[PDB]
């Protein structure tokens with residue numbers, strides 16, 4: 001009944017179908033992920049809903065906001081708590097190999113869409129000691 | 135320093151405790167590249183204890199950048215909800231710290247672990263792990 005989220009799910013599934021790497025481990029620990037950001041709040045939200053449908057094996061944070069980076073010039077840097085309008089969400093995964101596959105699928109999916117969707121960025125991330133999701 | 139009535143806010147005391155621990159480690163906090171390639175992922179405790187830790191971390195460390203507080207999903211066997219399992223939100227909170235160096239992320243992870251162990255529950259239940267971002271995060 002949510003055609004927008006289902007159409008994103010189908011786009012992701014079509015891309016993820018090219019790979020057969022393991023998505024879970026016997027340990028079940030959350031040791032990798034994909035960090036997804038930019039675009040717009042709504043385009044990220046839509047991508048998050050489609051990711052949830054396409055990947056039952058992942059876990060997702062809500063959207064939240066990124067802080068600023070470095071400011072050019074000699075003027076003051078932003079304080080560490082200052083929030084931008086750029087949003088992000090995190091995908092938690094049990095294998096790094098599937099994180100890499102998902103990162104590539106998200107990149108390939110969003111580049112076929114108009115702005116602001118094509119401005120979504122993604123990087124793999126790893127958690128040294130894992131994240132003990134509750 | 136001592137505030138009115140012989141008390142400081144918890145976040146100020148966190149900042150001072152972190153400053154003391156971090157002074158033990160003379161490691162690089164920035165790079166010429168300036169890229170945000172490392173982090174610490176801080177979670178658990180309670181919303182109030184994380185609130186104080188986040189505010190104290192900011193005060194102690196100008197070289198870092200912090201997300202707001204937010205919520206974690208469940209791991210195995212999520213709780214109920216009308217939406218898919220991967221989206222269901224627990225009551226456990228988290229924040230992230232972005233950093234320019236891997237070594238300082240390690241030092242900060244150790245400092246937070248050491249500091250929260252000296253506090254009463256629920257602060258001592260806060261968890262932390264280093265993280266790394268393969269391609270960096272292009273903070274705005």
Ligand SMILES: Cc1onc(NC(=O)CSCC(=O)O)c1Br
Nearest residue numbers: 041045048061062063064065087
């Ligand atoms: C910021 C922001 O932008 N969209 C969001 N929603 C979710 O991530 C899932 S629904 C909960 C809600 O929206 O309050 C949030 Br939080």
Ligand SMILES: O=C(O)c1ccccc1-n1cccc1
Nearest residue numbers: 008043046047109110113117
């Ligand atoms: O809704 C979005 O912005 C979106 C997000 C991620 C991937 C595809 C999307 N899309 C865009 C048009 C049709 C699908």
